[PDB]
Each structure stands twice: as structure tokens, then as C-alpha cells.
Design a protein around this ligand. Structure first.
Ligand SMILES: O=C(CO)[C@@H](O)[C@H](O)[C@H](O)COP(=O)(O)O
Length: 310
């Protein structure tokens, strides 16, 4: 009698959503993802302070020409990479590293940031095939990802809240999309001051991923659909069969400790078109923007921590 976690792995690529590599080992996910909030958490909790201190010393040594601001930016990238490297030691698949959320509306600076991350991984002996560059799915992010994919850099288009938005990502040939589930359900609950989670059939977040999956499979899009942002284990279970699901260590532990039967449930857009379709979706418009704001705040806090340790 396999746990729900082991049953899930039979039909879905399980991915760990964390920067805490020591936790990853015990769940044996295929891939791992680290957003700016998770990098911040890992750095703040100080489980890896030596790794951080060493990263700061290394970057200073190799960059005697950089001023304070430029140096901090280079250290921030090296920290993302350092965590990714430690994760890659304990998984067989890929790790996702996110570009600075502040470049979300600039395709050119997104491209350059993505390339810098990739170059730092390569300088450290990690080939680009083991990495996904995570980019917020604004029109600018998708356009950047289109170019990056053409140049062999696989991308993880995140902060996906609308089906049309997911369709445009697939049209750009992106490797993977991360449709959010929990934040969509959060909007749904706040709309009507719901205190309890909706029934699964009525969960807007779960339904959004189901609709994206259905679209991708019927249209033959090869982009991987990876559900992300979970509020509870029931939302993860509801998406069993999805191509991939990125899950927090807490929820992975919950899945590992449950042993009931797991029902397997899942088995040409122009810029103007894209902007129109996103505008029609109040939730998506708000949540994409909020996501970028929140990740920005966490990136700024990480910068502040770096600055205090120079
Ligand atoms: O999409 C990814 C990685 O592909 C995750 O890192 C999400 O950023 C995370 O799952 C959001 O979770 P909440 O912040 O909504 O709890």
C-alpha cells in the first residue's frame, strides 16, 4: 500500500518547491523550483549562512571592478546559482532559478539576466540542460522566453493565471508553465469572504489547471503543465495525473504520510490579443501584478541582507 506521494509519482512528475536542499532528499522529487520568496526564506533562516558568506567572498574576489550596487546584483545571482547547485546534487532532474522580478516588463533585460544565470551555472560546472529560468508570464517575459528557447535555454513561465496566457506561452515554445492554483483560490475566497475552501469541483484554482491541461493535450502543445501554489494537500491530490506538480516540503510530507487510494483525475495570439484577454480576467490582472510586486519585495530584502554582509 503505497503512500499518496508514491502513487502520485507514478502519474505525475513530482517537483519540490523549496530552496532547502536538505529537505529535498527525503521526498526524492524529479525536479525542484526556487522562487524569490523561497530563496529569501532559505537565506533568512540561516541554515546555509556559510554558503552565503562564501558566495559573497568569491564574488568580491572575482569582481574587483564592480561598485556597491553592481556587486550586490552579481552576488544575488551567485546566491541563486549556489542554491541551485546544492539542489542539483540531490536530484536527478532540473532546478528552476528565477530572474529578478524587477525586469518583468523588459524583455531585453530579462534575456540578459537569464543568460547571466546560465553563464554562472556553466562557470560552476553545471550544464544548462539541468536548469530552467523562471520568468513571470507577462507579455515581455513570454517574448524573452521565445528568444531564450530559440537559443537553447529552457524556461519556466510562472505566475500563470489565465488560459490564454498559458496558450501564448505554449505558442512561444516554452519548456514549462507554472499555473497557480492556490492564489486563484485565494481570490475566489476573498471575493465572497469564504472562510472554508470550496469543494474541489468548484475550486477556481484547480479548475484553471484542469482547463490548461485540457487545452494543451487537445492541441498537442508539448509544453509541460506544472501546477504550482498550493494551499492544502486536497488541491494537489485533485490534480493527480497533471504533467508535473511543484509542491512545498510541508505538503510533500502530508502526501508521504497518507496512504489512501489516489484517484488519477487528469489523463497566433498577438500582443494586442494577449493584453485584451488578460484585461478581461480581473483576477489574472490583479494576481500577476501582485506576484511581481511580492517577489520584488523579497528580492529587495535579499539585497538588503547581502548589503549587511559585505
Ligand atoms: O511556480 C513555482 C515554480 O515553478 C513556485 O515556486 C511558485 O512560485 C509557488 O508554488 C507559489 O506558491 P505561493 O507563493 O502561492 O504559496
Amino acid at each position: 500500500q503505497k503512500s499518496v506521494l508514491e502513487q502520485l509519482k507514478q502519474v505525475t512528475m513530482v517537483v519540490a518547491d523549496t530552496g532547502d536542499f536538505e529537505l529535498i532528499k527525503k521526498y526524492k522529487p524529479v525536479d525542484a523550483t526556487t522562487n524569490p520568496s523561497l530563496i529569501l526564506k532559505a537565506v533568512k533562516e540561516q541554515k546555509y549562512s556559510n554558503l552565503v558568506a562564501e558566495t559573497i567572498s568569491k564574488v568580491k574576489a572575482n569582481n574587483p571592478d564592480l561598485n556597491s550596487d553592481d556587486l550586490v546584483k552579481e552576488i544575488a545571482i551567485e546566491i541563486l546559482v549556489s542554491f541551485g547547485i546544492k539542489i542539483l546534487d540531490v536530484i536527478e532532474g532540473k532546478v528552476s532559478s528565477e530572474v529578478d522580478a524587477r525586469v518583468s516588463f523588459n524583455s531585453a533585460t530579462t534575456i540578459d539576466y537569464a543568460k547571466r544565470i546560465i553563464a554562472r551555472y556553466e562557470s560552476n560546472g553545471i550544464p544548462k540542460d539541468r536548469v530552467l529560468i523562471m520568468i513571470a508570464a507577462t507579455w515581455e517575459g513570454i517574448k524573452a522566453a521565445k528568444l531564450l528557447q530559440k537559443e537553447g535555454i529552457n524556461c519556466n513561465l510562472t505566475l500563470i493565471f489565465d488560459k490564454a496566457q498559458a496558450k501564448a506561452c505554449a505558442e512561444a515554445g516554452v519548456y514549462l508553465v507554472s499555473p497557480f492554483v492556490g492564489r486563484i483560490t485565494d481570490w475566489q475566497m476573498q471575493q465572497n469572504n469564504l472562510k472554508t475552501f470550496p469543494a474541489i469541483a468548484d475550486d477556481d484554482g484547480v479548475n484553471s489547471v484542469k482547463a490548461i491541461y485540457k487545452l494543451y493535450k487537445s492541441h498537442g502543445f508539448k509544453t509541460i503543465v506544472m501546477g504550482a501554489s498550493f494551499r492544502n494537500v486536497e488541491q494537489v491530490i485533485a490534480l493527480a495525473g497533471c504533467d508535473a506538480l511543484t509542491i512545498s516540503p510541508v505538503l510533500l510530507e502530508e502526501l508521504k504520510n497518507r496512504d489512501e487510494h489516489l484517484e488519477v483525475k487528469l489523463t497566433q495570439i498577438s500582443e494586442a490579443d494577449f493584453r485584451w484577454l488578460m484585461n478581461e480576467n480581473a483576477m489574472a490582472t490583479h494576481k500577476l501584478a501582485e506576484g511581481i510586486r511580492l517577489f520584488t519585495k523579497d528580492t529587495i530584502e535579499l539585497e538588503n541582507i547581502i548589503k549587511q554582509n559585505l
